[model samples]
Target: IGTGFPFDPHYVEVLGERMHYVDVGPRDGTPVLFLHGNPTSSYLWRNIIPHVAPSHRCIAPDLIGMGKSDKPDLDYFFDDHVRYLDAFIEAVGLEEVVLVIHDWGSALGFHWAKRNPERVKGIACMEFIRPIPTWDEWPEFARETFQAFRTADVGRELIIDQNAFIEGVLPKCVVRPLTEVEMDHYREPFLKPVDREPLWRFPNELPIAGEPANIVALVEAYMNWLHQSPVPKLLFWGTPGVLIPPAEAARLAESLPNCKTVDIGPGLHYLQEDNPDLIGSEIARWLPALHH
Candidate 1:
């Protein structure tokens, strides 16, 4: 945890704080923005970016307090992230964007596209979450664990004090045992208890059973837009994945008009760690169709 980030860090001043991003490959190509979810950063795409970098500019940003970004005194709410992301997109001057999203990234990307349809070229998402979900939607363990994460007191102890997200949840999400180097990289940003605030807050902000009215409204609108947008989309799901169930993936693939769903073999929530090469190749192939 030497405050070392793998990619050559590109810093931009957005919303009065420094946002860390990885910008690679030719600038002339259509920009592909990679968005990672909780407890991960632009570093999540390190292996995946190179596969598409030769063809497009891959830009992955570290959300607010995560990664190598400047941590500011902020609530780290859903809206707070959206605000920073919007500014980051504009600050980079990207006119047409092809978004690569995962987990909560899908929520943010889909919501952003719903509002700024004209600016987006296409979207690719995996292990997506809810516009809203009934309590019964999650499996017993997931429900119980997420319930614990949502609890204020328990969340503080688990995420901040124990560092459960980087320590516990992350390893479980991937199939292969993570190497020490990789785990260390993930642990770098959350080395301090206070810096782990964003990690604790993310689970609490999850939209469940329509309790968080504002977040649900935002995601609900995007779900509607996603069904009808006609924007080319790529949906990836792993075999018997955790966050996104396999049956749900099949239903979404069959239902969404403009989507091509690829089962990137076996993996869990952090599919990229297990199948980065395959995911990158699939996306690279998909990009040709969008531009041609």
Candidate 2:
């Protein structure tokens, strides 16, 4: 069990399954919701929550099946995640939300914001951006890796049977190595092959070859909303992270209505692990000024 995570766990019944989360800070404070991606849970925000909780209500939820949440026998498709997320927001009565997301959470957050634009106050994002250009637009190495994940047999071996995403990919993605205790918290959820279903489904849902039209459409819709919405947006990026390279981040910054970009320095896809303090403080400083 992970002892260092500062908050107590809470649960809400959504779609007949228990959704786990950590809610801290004053009930009247500004609501800031943190969402994590694949093979990770609310534990990813452990460091950041403390910095913001003094003046803000910080809530971090484990996506269904990925964290302390219940894992039902379902496909765990892109829509499945969105459905639970939608229900979660309603169940918790989260409104005027400030979203902080990374990896798959980025996609889910943007999708929610587009549909319920009035309810969202601001967005802080890192790593994965959706409606990304075609596979041809990606670098060679990235394209190859995507293909491997989408490959049936190879992906099954690595993600399901061996738990390579939690065991292999995550360690490499962080600049600061995870301690054994921290790694154990992440690994414990997916110990059995059946529990690892969501891990394999995420990469496969990438809008690569224009398949998964539903996700692609959601991306396009949200991208349009991003360009037009006057809501404040903050983007963070780190080196050696393939998802949001410098050029793409710059392009996104230029296109969005009210957007700021920061280079957080020397991390991989999981910038939260390497630069949590910086991320937390930056958001604390940035968010207040936006509302003023």
lDDT of 1 by residue, 14-132 (tens): 97899999998889868999999998988788888878998999999999999898888788998899999999999999988899999778788998898889878889889876654
Best candidate according to lDDT = 1
TM-score of each: 0.96, 0.95
What 10-residue stretch in candidate 1 is worst by lDDT?
1-10
134-222 per-residue lDDT for model 2 (tens digits): 78765565566667778689988878888878987788788877889899888888877889989999888877667578778878888
Candidate 2 backbone collisions, by pair: none
lDDT of each: 0.85, 0.85
Give the number of colliding residue pairs in candidate 1: 0
Please identify model 1 stretches exceeding 4 Å from their true place: 1-6
Q: Output candidate 2 Cα RMSD.
A: 1.9
Candidate 1 to truth, TM = 0.96
Model 1 steric clash pairs: none
